[PDB]
Symmetry: D2
C-alpha cells in the first residue's frame, strides 16, 4: 500500500540520503555515497528525481576533465533509471571562504566569486534539465549587530539576484529562481529569515517574475510559524516554485527529520493544501537520515518520506470528500470566507445600515463557529478513526 | 540626565499606562484611568503625544452625544498640555463579535461591520491630526487547520485594505496605514505573522504606497527573530511608517515590558539603526506596566521607556563617533559591504579572471573578520566601560 | 466507536468546560456555567469525574451559608450522576491580592493568607473524597531580576509545603499533594518551571513521600521539552500522582487545546507510556474550548479529549502487540537497554578487556540502530496504515 | 580597566579557544591549536586555568607512550604559566561509537566502554589536580519515541554514575562529579534536559553528596528558561559545583557566544547572584569564538568573556551597595521575603485571625510592589547611567 511511483514527483537532494552524519559534536557515521548509487537506490524506492548542489556532484576544485567525468557518470545513472533533475543549487556555505556569506559577504571579492560559482552551476543545471534553481543563503547574516549592515546587505543581495536574472535572460534560459528562507543556523540570524521576508524581497527585484520561494517545513517551524499558512501566502502570491519537505520538532536546530515526523498535523494540513491547490512542482525532500542509521536505515527513512506523504494525501482527500465534513465546513462558514466582503462597492457598504446601525452585534457574537467539531472530523480522518 | 522632551517624539497608547492588569489568569489590579489623566501625566513626564483605539477613547456603544463629550474632554487635555495624536487604530479584537476576526472573519456580516467601525474611526483620527492609522489584526487567524482557508482570508484582507485605501483617497485624507504583524496570541496563529509577511502582502494591494508596517519589538521576538534586522528590511523597502517599542524575553506570550527591558542589546542595535537611518516617526511605546504596580509604578515604567531610549541613543551615538570603532568597522569591511558587487556589469564580471580562475580562495578564507573586537567595542560603549 | 466510560477515569476541571473565553485581548464569549450543569453534561459524555479550584465551586467571599448551599447542590449533582471528585486545588492566582504570589509573595501577610485559604479547601477536598490536592503556583515568580530572591522564595515555598504536610498528617488525612510546574505565564518566569525542578524541590521537603507532580502536556511544551520524557522521569521517581492532559503548539502562551491537538505524536507516545507503565490515576483534562465555540462546541471539544485518548490507546496497544514491532525493538536493542550495564560489579568491569583493550570500537560504530524503521512502524500504527 | 587576574578564577576549556570552526554546514576555518599554545595565550590574558576532555589533550587511540608525551608537554605549559586544571571531562559524544549514547547507549558493550573511558580519564584528572569531573551526556536521548525507553535509560544512567561514585570512593579521591544538562542538540531530545531534571536525578543516586550540577548559560536558555533562577535553585540545593559561562540568543541551536553576549541582562543578574552567594568555584567559559574569526579574534573573544564578567561584577556590586537601591528593595519587601512565613508554627497560624477572617484582602491588593522603579535602578546601574 502507499507505493510511490515517479508520477508522484518525489525528489531528493543528493546531500540528503548522502549525508554522512557529521553534526556539531560528532564525526561522520556513514561513508560517502557515490551519486550514482543514490540515483539507483532512490529509483528503486519509486522516486522521480534528484537534486544537487554543485559540490555534491563535482568535488570542489575539480579540473575540467574531472568535472566532465563526474557529470557523465551521473547522467548515465539518470538515463539507466529514468530519474530526472528538476532543481539544482549552489553550495555557498561549506567552504571557509563563505564564512561571512556569499552574495552578502562583507568582502567584495567573495561576493564576485560567489556569483561566478553560481553562474557556472546554472549552466550545468540547464544542461541537466532543471526548471528551478534554488538559493539558500545560509551564510548571509551575522552573530553580532555591528558586523552586518542589513540595508547594505539587502542592496548586495538584490544586486546579486538581479545579475543572475540578467544572466538567465541573456542566455534565453527558462529556469527560474527559488529563494529558500531560514531564520538562523549556521549564522546567528540569517537574512530573509521567513517566507514572508523572501516574498517581500522578491517584489523589489528588477524582474520579479523570475523569482519565487523554496520554503522548507522545518525552517519556518524554527521560528515557531505555521508552515501551511506560509505556503498559503506563497500560493496566494503565485510564488511557490518549489518546496522542501521534512520534519522538525519546534524551535531547535534544523533537524531535517523525515517528512511526516515532527509536526504530524502540520504535515497533514500541508498535504491537504498542496493537493487542494493543485501544486504541480516536485515534492522534494530535504531531510537527513539520523546518524544512528546504517544504509538500510537511510533507505528506510527515504521510503518513509514518500509513504507518509501518500498516507496524508489519502486522508486529506477523504476529509475533503466526506459529505459530513462538507456540511461542517458550511456550518463553520468556510463558504462565506470565500465570498467577497463588499462586491457592492465602497459607497454601498457606507450606505448599508445592516453593516452598522442595524447590525446586531450581540446576535452575531452568540453564533458559535463549530470549529472544534470540524477539527475532530479532521483528526478522525487523519487517524482513520471515523465512527 | 536623560530627560525626555517633546522634541524626542515619544508617544504612548492610552491602553498602555491605562492597562488595568487583567491577564489570562487574573483580575484587574488597577482602576481605569480617565484618558484626560493619562494625557496630563504623560505630558508631565515629557511625552510628545498619545495614541488610541476607538474604544479606548469612546466606550463601545456610546451615543453620538456621549461620543462628542468624550472627544471634547480629550481634546481639552491635549490643548492643555500640547500633546499630539500622531496615530490611531481600531479595536477589532476585544468584543466577542470579533472572536474569529474582523476583516477576515468567516462571517461576511462581521467583515462588513469591521470595515464600518474602522472607517468611522479613520474620520476621527484625521480630525485629531493623526498621520498614521494602525491595523493590528489580532483576531485574524485560527487555532485549527480547517477553520480558516488562508488564501481566501488573504483575499478578504486585501479587499478590506483596498476599500480603506479607496476611502481615504476619496476623502482626500493624507493619513497612511501601518499594518502591525504578530505571530500568535490571541489566535493560535495570526495571519501576516511577521514584518516580512506584512511587507509582502502590501505589495499586492491596489495602492501600495498608502501602506507600511508598524513593527513591534516583542512581536518579532515571539518568533525568535532579530528585530533590528526586520526594521532594516522595512527601512530598505521604504515602509517603516511607525514603530511600537517595548521589551520581550524571547518566545513567550506577549509581555509588553517597558522598552529597554527584555533583550537589551537588541534595544541598543534598534536605537542605533533608527537614529543612523534618520527615522522621523514617533517613538511609540506599546507596553504594559506589570500588574504588580500601583499608579506610581505605572508612571515610573513609562518614564523608564523614554529614559532607556535616551541612554541607548547616547551610547549608540558614542559608538558610531568613536575613531576606534570607525577603524574597527573598516577592519571588518563594513565599508566594502556598502559598495556595489559589480557596478562594472555582468559581462565584465563574467570576463574577470580575478573573480574565478585567479581568485585565491584559501587566501581569502584566511582573512579574519575581526567581528569579535568590533562587538566588544560595542559592548564597552553600551555599558560605558571604554578603557 | 471509542466511546468513553467511567472505567477510563476521564476527569475534567470545572474551569475547563466552564471557561467563559476571556483572554488577554478579549471579553468573555460564553456565559458562566453552573457547576451542576457541567457535572451532568460531562457525565452524559462518559466522564468519570470533575475537579475544582475552591473559587470555581464557591464564589470568592461567600458566607458560610452560601458555601454550604453551593457544596450541597454540587454534591447532589455528583450523586445524581455517579461522578467523582478525585482532585481539588486552590485558586492562588486570580484575585489581585495574589499578584506577586501566594506562598512566595514578598508580603508575609499574603503568604499566611494563602496558606489559610489552601487549608480551608484541603478540608473540603477531603470531604468530597479527593485523593490528590494540586498546587499550581502560577503567580510565584517575577518579571524582573531584583523583585524576587529565588533562594528566599524557595525557602518560603518549602516552608509552605512543609506546613501543609504537617496539617494533613495532624488531621490523619490520606490526601497527597501534586505540584504543577509551568515555565512562564502569567509571571515572566515561574518558580519550579519544569517537572525536573519540581521533582528536585520535593526531595528537600520534610515529608517527601506526601508530594508528587501534576505535569501538564502544554506546560512542558512551553519550554520546548519532551513531555513523554518528563513523564518517564516522574514515573521513574515514583512521583506521577496526577496528570493534566491537553494540547499545545510549541513555544507560545498556554493554549490548553483539547487533548490530541497540538503535538499529536507526543500525545501518542504519552498514551503509550501511561498505559505501558500502568498509570492508575485520573486521565484529567486541563483544557479550554476555544472562545470561538458555543456550548455545543464546548461539549464537542470535551468529547474529543476523551476520544483522542482512546484512539491513541488503541494504536499504541496495537504497536506494542505487533510481532513485527517486537522484532524491530529487538533489532534496535531496546531489550539490551533494559539490562544492567555491569551487574558483575565495578571490579569485574575494570578487569574486563572486552570493555576496553579488546573492544572493537569501529565494529560497534558500524552497527546501525534501525531506529527509522521502528519509527515508521510506529507512524503506520498511529495512522492505521499498516501494509 | 577590568583587567583579569588569576585571582578571578577564570578558566577555559581547551575546546573553546581551540574550536576549529566546523559547524553543521561548514568546514573548519582555523587550524588546530596545540594545547600548549592555548595555555600560554590564555595565561597572557589573565586566565587562571584550563579544562579538557580526554580527547582534547590526548588524541583518541593514542599509545601509552604518546599519551605520556602529550601530558608531559601540557604539564610543562601549566608549570611555565602557573595555570591550573580545576575540572576535566570525558568526550562521550564525538566518536561514532557513541552515536546512541555512552552511559545510556542501547548497546550494553558501548555502555561498558563508555565507563572504562571515563574511569581512565578520572585518574588523569586527579593527577592534574582537578576538583570536579563534568559529565555532559550530549548523546543520551533520542530522535524518535520508540528508540529510547527513558525509564530504562535513567536506570542505566544511575547505574553508571553509581559505579563512578564507587570508583572514586574506592580510590580515596576527593574529586566530585558535576552533571551538565542540555535540552537538545545533538540528540533531538537529551536526557536530563535542565538543571531541575539533573538535580532531581542526583537525589536518587546511591551517594548523592558526590554529585552536583554544571549548568551552562546557553543550555538553559535553549529551553527559554531563566538561567539565574536555575542557578538559584542549584545554590539552594547545595549543588552548584561548577558553572559554564557563555551567551545565547534564545531558543536556537547552542551558540556558545562569548559571555556577556546574548542575554546581557541575564548575565548581569547571574553575576549578581554568584557574587552575592559567594560562589567559590571556577568562572569557566564554555564558548566558541565564531568561525568568522582568525586567531587574533579568538583571543579577543576570550578576553571579552573575562572583561564582561568583571564589568558586570562592578555594576552589580554598585547596585547592591547603593543606599537608594537598598531603600527600593525594602519598598518592594525583599526583606520580608527572607523572613519565615510562620515561625510561630502551624497551630498559631490556624488560630491567627489576621491571616484569614480579619485579613483585609483589598487593602493588601492595593499595595504596589514598586518593582518597576527597582528594575530601572538596576538598569541604570548596569548601564552606568545613574542620575
Ligand atoms: Mg475556493
Ligand atoms: Mg551607508
Ligand atoms: Mg521493561
Ligand atoms: Mg539573605
Ligand atoms: Mn533544514
Ligand atoms: Mn532545504
Ligand atoms: Mn505586544
Ligand atoms: Mn503594538
Ligand atoms: Mn495550561
Ligand atoms: Mn493544569
Ligand atoms: Mn553549549
Ligand atoms: Mn558546557
Ligand atoms: Na549599499
Ligand atoms: Na504558486
Ligand atoms: Na477568496
Ligand atoms: Na521607511
Ligand atoms: Na530565606
Ligand atoms: Na509514579
Ligand atoms: Na531498566
Ligand atoms: Na552550591
Amino acid at each position: 500500500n502507499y507505493a510511490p511511483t515517479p508520477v508522484d514527483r518525489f525528489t531528493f537532494g543528493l546531500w540528503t540520503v548522502g549525508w554522512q552524519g557529521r553534526d556539531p559534536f560528532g564525526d561522520a557515521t556513514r561513508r560517502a555515497l557515490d551519486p550514482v548509487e543514490s540515483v539507483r537506490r532512490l529509483a528503486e524506492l519509486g522516486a522521480h528525481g534528484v537534486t544537487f548542489h554543485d559540490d555534491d556532484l563535482i568535488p570542489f576544485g575539480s579540473s575540467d576533465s574531472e568535472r566532465e567525468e563526474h557529470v557523465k557518470r551521473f547522467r548515465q545513472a539518470l538515463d539507466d533509471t529514468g530519474m530526472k533533475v528538476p532543481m539544482a543549487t549552489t553550495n555557498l556555505f561549506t567552504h571557509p571562504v563563505f564564512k561571512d556569506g556569499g552574495f552578502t559577504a562583507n568582502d567584495r571579492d567573495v561576493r564576485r566569486y560567489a556569483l561566478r560559482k553560481t553562474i557556472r552551476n546554472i549552466d550545468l543545471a540547464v544542461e541537466l534539465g532543471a526548471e528551478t534553481y534554488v538559493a539558500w543563503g545560509g551564510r548571509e547574516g551575522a552573530e553580532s549587530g555591528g558586523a552586518k549592515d542589513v540595508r547594505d546587505a539587502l542592496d548586495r543581495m538584490k544586486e546579486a539576484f538581479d545579475l543572475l536574472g540578467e544572466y538567465v535572460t541573456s542566455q534565453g534560459y527558462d529556469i527560474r529562481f527559488a529563494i529558500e528562507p531560514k531564520p538562523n543556523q549556521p549564522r546567528g540570524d540569517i537574512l530573509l529569515p521567513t517566507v514572508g521576508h523572501a516574498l517581500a524581497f522578491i517584489e523589489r527585484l528588477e524582474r520579479p517574475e523570475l523569482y519565487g520561494v523554496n520554503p522548507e517545513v522545518g525552517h519556518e517551524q524554527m521560528a515557531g510559524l505555521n508552515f501551511p499558512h506560509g505556503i498559503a501566502q506563497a500560493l496566494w502570491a503565485g510564488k511557490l516554485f518549489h518546496i522542501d519537505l521534512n520534519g522538525q520538532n519546534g524551535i531547535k536546530y534544523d533537524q531535517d527529520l523525515r517528512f511526516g515526523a515532527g509536526d504530524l498535523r502540520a504535515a497533514f494540513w500541508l498535504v491537504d493544501l498542496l493537493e487542494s491547490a493543485g501544486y504541480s512542482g516536485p515534492r522534494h525532500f530535504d531531510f537527513k537520515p539520523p546518524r544512528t542509521e546504517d544504509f538500510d536505515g537511510v533507505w528506510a527513512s527515504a521510503a518513509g518520506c514518500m509513504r507518509n506523504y501518500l498516507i496524508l494525501k489519502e486522508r486529506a482527500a477523504a476529509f475533503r470528500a466526506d459529505p459530513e465534513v462538507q456540511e461542517a465546513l458550511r456550518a463553520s462558514r468556510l463558504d462565506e470566507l470565500a465570498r467577497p466582503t463588499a462586491a457592492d462597492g465602497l459607497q454601498a457598504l457606507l450606505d448599508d445600515r445592516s453593516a452598522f446601525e442595524e447590525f446586531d452585534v450581540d446576535a452575531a457574537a452568540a453564533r458559535g463557529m463549530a470549529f472544534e467539531r470540524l477539527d475532530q472530523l479532521a483528526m478522525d480522518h487523519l487517524l482513520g478513526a471515523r465512527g
